[PDB]
Amino acid sequence: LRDNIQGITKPAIRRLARRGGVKRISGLIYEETRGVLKVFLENVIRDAVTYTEHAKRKTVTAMDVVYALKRQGRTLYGFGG
Amino acid sequence: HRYRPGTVALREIRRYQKSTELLIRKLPFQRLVREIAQDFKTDLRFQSSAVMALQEASEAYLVALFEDTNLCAIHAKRVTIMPKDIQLARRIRGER
Amino acid sequence: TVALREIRRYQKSTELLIRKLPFQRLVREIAQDFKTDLRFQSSAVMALQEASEAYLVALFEDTNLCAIHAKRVTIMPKDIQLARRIRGER
Amino acid sequence: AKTRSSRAGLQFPVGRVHRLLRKGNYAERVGAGAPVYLAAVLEYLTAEILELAGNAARDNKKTRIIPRHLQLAVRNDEELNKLLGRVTIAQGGVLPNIQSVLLP
Amino acid sequence: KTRSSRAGLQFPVGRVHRLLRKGNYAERVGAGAPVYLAAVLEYLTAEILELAGNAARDNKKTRIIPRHLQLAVRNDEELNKLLGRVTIAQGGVLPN
Amino acid sequence: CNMRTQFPDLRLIQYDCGKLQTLAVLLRQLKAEGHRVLIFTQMTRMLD
Amino acid sequence: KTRKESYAIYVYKVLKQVHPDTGISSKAMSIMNSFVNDVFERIAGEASRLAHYNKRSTITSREIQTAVRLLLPGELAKHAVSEGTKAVTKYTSAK
Amino acid sequence: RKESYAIYVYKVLKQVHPDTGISSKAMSIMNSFVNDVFERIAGEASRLAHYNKRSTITSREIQTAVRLLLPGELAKHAVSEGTKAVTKYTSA
Amino acid sequence: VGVNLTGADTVVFYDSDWNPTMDAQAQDRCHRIGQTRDVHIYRLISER
DNA sequence: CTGACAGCTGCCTGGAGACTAGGGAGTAATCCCCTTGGCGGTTAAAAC
DNA sequence: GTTTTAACCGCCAAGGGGATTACTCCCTAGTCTCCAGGCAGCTGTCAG
């Protein structure tokens, strides 16, 4: 597993922008969005991994991700708790 | 026939705002999540529900950031979104 | 020239920029609607003034950033509106 | 034997709320009327959000509430939007909102 | 023999234990939890106090004032992140 | 060139795997009798 | 095979009280359960903090009323307080 | 009687800066900061215990709360300090 | 299944598949109707 | 003049000392549910 | 509009975790008792 950040695809970012109401997109937006998503995922995953390690488990459950998002201030519904 | 610029963009804006489906393929996101997690701790298993929750949260965050970026672009009398717009939105949001 | 000197002078200082009596009058006028014959400790009013000045300074910083993003030096009310809209207090 | 929810006239369980309050480590003691009040408030909030969700579902020619209907209800109501400002609803989408300047 | 002295710390392990017990955090508090919490608090206090003292030395002063604490907090990135949403009375803001 | 760089003999390929030895013997005998042989393997690196 | 307490039946009862004809999906029911749990956690934590501030060892109807006033916006808080006080009065009358 | 961290903050300051004093307003700031971080860590520990269905707060809960709350270098240094303190406490 | 390699007359399996139907299909790639010579199958296996 | 450190006072409370009930380790043991290196198609989202 | 390729789907396999439920059982808190020290706070004193 290496250089997986390119999996965030240019049409995917365009679709997300269109859902966000963006009409025209510059060519340099995609790298910035990739970096932002990388940072956000890093933070959430670090918190979730800490939660799982506390429970003496090795499988990251959806409850741990929900708790991590709630701690970050981004409480998510529909995945328990 | 060729639609004038901006019409198809608005049409897909309406299409993607009508729906609620996830816009990022599941396998690339799962790979990215495993790649990010392998740095913090090796031999970690992700449940499918956890990955789906991560994808939903990430898509919601990116949609909100794109809304803020478009608001920044309308400010200063523009239509295109530029990296400076994202940077301004993030800086006002309190990140970095 | 004078603006930069004033910026530096107020940046090095720590004293409260808003006058105490007008802010107390405004706080009491606002509190009059929620409850009648309300008493305020002096420390409470000082805390309110500190919080209000910090909030206003932070908002002005965000609006100056918004104005700079608009290739302008002057801050305009649209900058305040966008700063509050992006921050989420709207 | 008569349940406390029946006595209070509510639908939410007073006994379950009392157990959760006791086991949640909120205080040494829990009052008798606290679970009743909390159940009433929870029932009212559920009623409001479900009324708006059902209105959205009827507006969408659908009988069952889906998460999109709940998201539309929450975001269209200003008070519920403020209450659930930092909350993301799974499979909820976003409100249809295209800025005026972008329109042709 | 003092429990704080036994643990080799300066913060009141006993007071932290009493606060954890009287607080409604859990129905049981272990022996090592107050010691660990006191150690963490002591470390954070030592860090912020060292930074404030360095700032005070940079200002040719001998007493720590709230301005020195504000400068120390805002200059250190980690402490700025920890206290990001915190306003210090009579602390001012960083030079700009 | 021979004094500047040395490459392993292609003979060493067969010497490191018994299968290749037996396959060489069998293939040469099959060609001697005048047949055509199809070799099937599950790995493409093995095909290389 | 173990009990998992949930507000599914109560949310369904409230839905039938409000809309006798409309229905709800499993994901929507999970979202509603999460919302109820979140509001419960918010109100309970606010009440616990209120009790701690006033050096009180109990959670009463006053604490939850103040928590609802602090959390919910204007009209929502007012109507919620009306409903809660009606419920508590009826409960006291029923003994 | 009112309890405060002024004595312990003064002792820590004297340990780190023997010749440096602290003003009363700064001491109040320090007390508020200590109470805030204490409450945050304790609340995270309580939530961790409740999530894992444990009736006891142990050193593991405090360590995990510290790792969750404090940023990287601060978190690792605090974890090392807490582990050292616990090791010294248990060996007596 | 569109391959008609009836010119060959010998098949050697470098390694064996876990599914014998696959090996049978490979054999039938040459052993089908329209082939006029005896077909031989050779399988190589490593001892121990 | 004026905040801050210190010597001293009075007191609440944390340090010893005992039982001990149970919350939290050991120990099966069941079962689901994968798990991943190498392969071969097959388009429809990507890419240009 | 025209061309690339990668989700992804299906084999192919042997076992391998590793959450769970249930049993037992025993260190370690909790509660109680008693007593002396850490501490809140007071004013005196002193540098700024």
Swiss-Prot record, chain B:
Lipidation (S-palmitoyl cysteine): C72
Protein's job: Core component of nucleosome. Nucleosomes wrap and compact DNA into chromatin, limiting DNA accessibility to the cellular machineries which require DNA as a template. Histones thereby play a central role in transcription regulation, DNA repair, DNA replication and chromosomal stability. DNA accessibility is regulated via a complex set of post-translational modifications of histones, also called histone code, and nucleosome remodeling.
Residue list for modification N6-succinyllysine: K18, K41, K84
Transport recorded as keyword: no
Subunit structure: The nucleosome is a histone octamer containing two molecules each of H2A, H2B, H3 and H4 assembled in one H3-H4 heterotetramer and two H2A-H2B heterodimers. The octamer wraps approximately 147 bp of DNA.
GO cellular component assignments: nucleoplasm; nucleosome
Keywords, comma-separated and alphabetical: Acetylation, ADP-ribosylation, Chromosome, Citrullination, DNA-binding, Hydroxylation, Lipoprotein, Methylation, Nucleosome core, Nucleus, Palmitate, Phosphoprotein, Ubl conjugation
Positions bearing N6-lactoyllysine: K18, K41
N6,N6,N6-trimethyllysine: residues carrying this PTM: K18, K41
Family: Belongs to the histone H3 family.
N6-crotonyllysine carried by residues: K18
Cystine bridges: none
GO terms of molecular function: DNA binding; protein heterodimerization activity; structural constituent of chromatin
Compartments, record wording: Nucleus; Chromosome
This protein's record includes keyword Ribosomal protein: no
N6-acetyllysine modification, residue list: K18, K41, K77, K84
Modified residues (N6,N6-dimethyllysine): K41
Residues bearing the modification N6-(2-hydroxyisobutyryl)lysine: K18, K26, K41, K84
Interval of the full protein contained in this chain: 40 to 135 of 136
Positions bearing Phosphoserine: S19, S48
Protein name: Histone H3.2
Superkingdom as given in the UniProt entry: Eukaryota
Modified-residue entries (N6-glutaryllysine), positions: K18, K41, K77, K84
UniProtKB/Swiss-Prot annotation, chain G:
Numbered residues of crosslink Glycyl lysine isopeptide (Lys-Gly) (interchain with G-Cter in ubiquitin): K90
One GO MF term: protein heterodimerization activity
PTMs per UniProt: Monoubiquitination of Lys-90 by BRE1 gives a specific tag for epigenetic transcriptional activation and is also prerequisite for histone H3 'Lys-4' and 'Lys-79' methylation.
Keywords: Acetylation, Chromosome, DNA-binding, Glycoprotein, Isopeptide bond, Nucleosome core, Nucleus, Phosphoprotein, Ubl conjugation
GO cellular component: nucleosome; nucleus
Superkingdom to which the source organism belongs: Eukaryota
Subcellular location, principal: nucleus
Glycan attachment positions: S82
Cellular compartment(s): Nucleus; Chromosome
Similarity field: Belongs to the histone H2B family.
Function: Core component of nucleosome. Nucleosomes wrap and compact DNA into chromatin, limiting DNA accessibility to the cellular machineries which require DNA as a template. Histones thereby play a central role in transcription regulation, DNA repair, DNA replication and chromosomal stability. DNA accessibility is regulated via a complex set of post-translational modifications of histones, also called histone code, and nucleosome remodeling.
Subunit record text: The nucleosome is a histone octamer containing two molecules each of H2A, H2B, H3 and H4 assembled in one H3-H4 heterotetramer and two H2A-H2B heterodimers. The octamer wraps approximately 147 bp of DNA.
Listed name of the protein: Histone H2B 1.1
Organism in which the protein naturally occurs: Xenopus laevis
Location of this fragment in the whole protein: 32 to 126 of 126
Curated annotation (Swiss-Prot), chain H:
Organism for this UniProt entry: Xenopus laevis (African clawed frog)
Name of the protein in question: Histone H2B 1.1
Compartment(s): Nucleus; Chromosome
Cross-link entry Glycyl lysine isopeptide (Lys-Gly) (interchain with G-Cter in ubiquitin), positions: K88
Quaternary structure note: The nucleosome is a histone octamer containing two molecules each of H2A, H2B, H3 and H4 assembled in one H3-H4 heterotetramer and two H2A-H2B heterodimers. The octamer wraps approximately 147 bp of DNA.
An example Gene Ontology CC term for this record: nucleus
Residues of this chain annotated as glycosylated in UniProt: S80
GO molecular function terms attached to this record: DNA binding; protein heterodimerization activity; structural constituent of chromatin
Entry keywords, A to Z: Acetylation, Chromosome, DNA-binding, Glycoprotein, Isopeptide bond, Nucleosome core, Nucleus, Phosphoprotein, Ubl conjugation
Family: Belongs to the histone H2B family.
Function: Core component of nucleosome. Nucleosomes wrap and compact DNA into chromatin, limiting DNA accessibility to the cellular machineries which require DNA as a template. Histones thereby play a central role in transcription regulation, DNA repair, DNA replication and chromosomal stability. DNA accessibility is regulated via a complex set of post-translational modifications of histones, also called histone code, and nucleosome remodeling.
Predominant place of localization: nucleus
UniProtKB/Swiss-Prot annotation, chain I:
Compartments reported by the entry: Nucleus
Residues spanning the membrane: none
Disease note: Floating-Harbor syndrome: A rare genetic disorder characterized by proportionate short stature, delayed bone age, delayed speech development, and typical facial features. The face is triangular with deep-set eyes, long eyelashes, bulbous nose, wide columella, short philtrum, and thin lips.
Function (record text): Catalytic component of the SRCAP complex which mediates the ATP-dependent exchange of histone H2AZ/H2B dimers for nucleosomal H2A/H2B, leading to transcriptional regulation of selected genes by chromatin remodeling. Acts as a coactivator for CREB-mediated transcription, steroid receptor-mediated transcription, and Notch-mediated transcription.
Family: Belongs to the SNF2/RAD54 helicase family. SWR1 subfamily.
Subunit structure: Interacts with CREBBP and EP300. May be part of a complex containing SRCAP, CREBBP, CARM1 and GRIP1. Component of the chromatin-remodeling SRCAP complex composed of at least SRCAP, DMAP1, RUVBL1, RUVBL2, ACTL6A, YEATS4, VPS72, ACTR6 and ZNHIT1. Component of a NuA4-related complex which contains EP400, TRRAP/PAF400, SRCAP, BRD8/SMAP, EPC1, DMAP1/DNMAP1, RUVBL1/TIP49, RUVBL2, actin, ACTL6A/BAF53A, VPS72 and YEATS4/GAS41.
Name recorded for this polypeptide: Helicase SRCAP
Organism: Homo sapiens (Human)
Lineage: Eukaryota, Metazoa, Chordata, Craniata, Vertebrata
Chain's gene name: SRCAP
Residues shown, of full length: 2123 to 2170 of 3230
